[PDB]
């Protein structure tokens, strides 16, 4: 009986390894777009540009 | 990330460069003129010339 309570625990494991890999792929995204915005935040930092590019 | 932010770092310097440069065909320019004006200048300081030529 004891030996037969395994598969439990490991559909356990494998639902937290599929849980953390699409949080993988959205921290990806994340990523991604946080570096575009560090990005448009130095393109914005300088003052030389017009109204309208701000 | 830090690698990729570079380009608004290029893109600034481009523009300051390009803003320095019309500066300096313009102050070109006005070097010109005012080298024109001083001789226009030490033309006139002459006291033998009639009123019309002054």
Known sequence: ATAASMNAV??????G???????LA?????TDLLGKMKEKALA??????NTASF
Do not use: E, H, Y
């Open 10 to 15: 490991k559909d356990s494991l494998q639902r």
């Open 17 to 23: 390894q599929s849980t953390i890999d699409v949080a």
């Open 26 to 30: 959205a921290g990806d995204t994340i």
């Open 44 to 49: 914005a930092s300088d003052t030389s540009l």
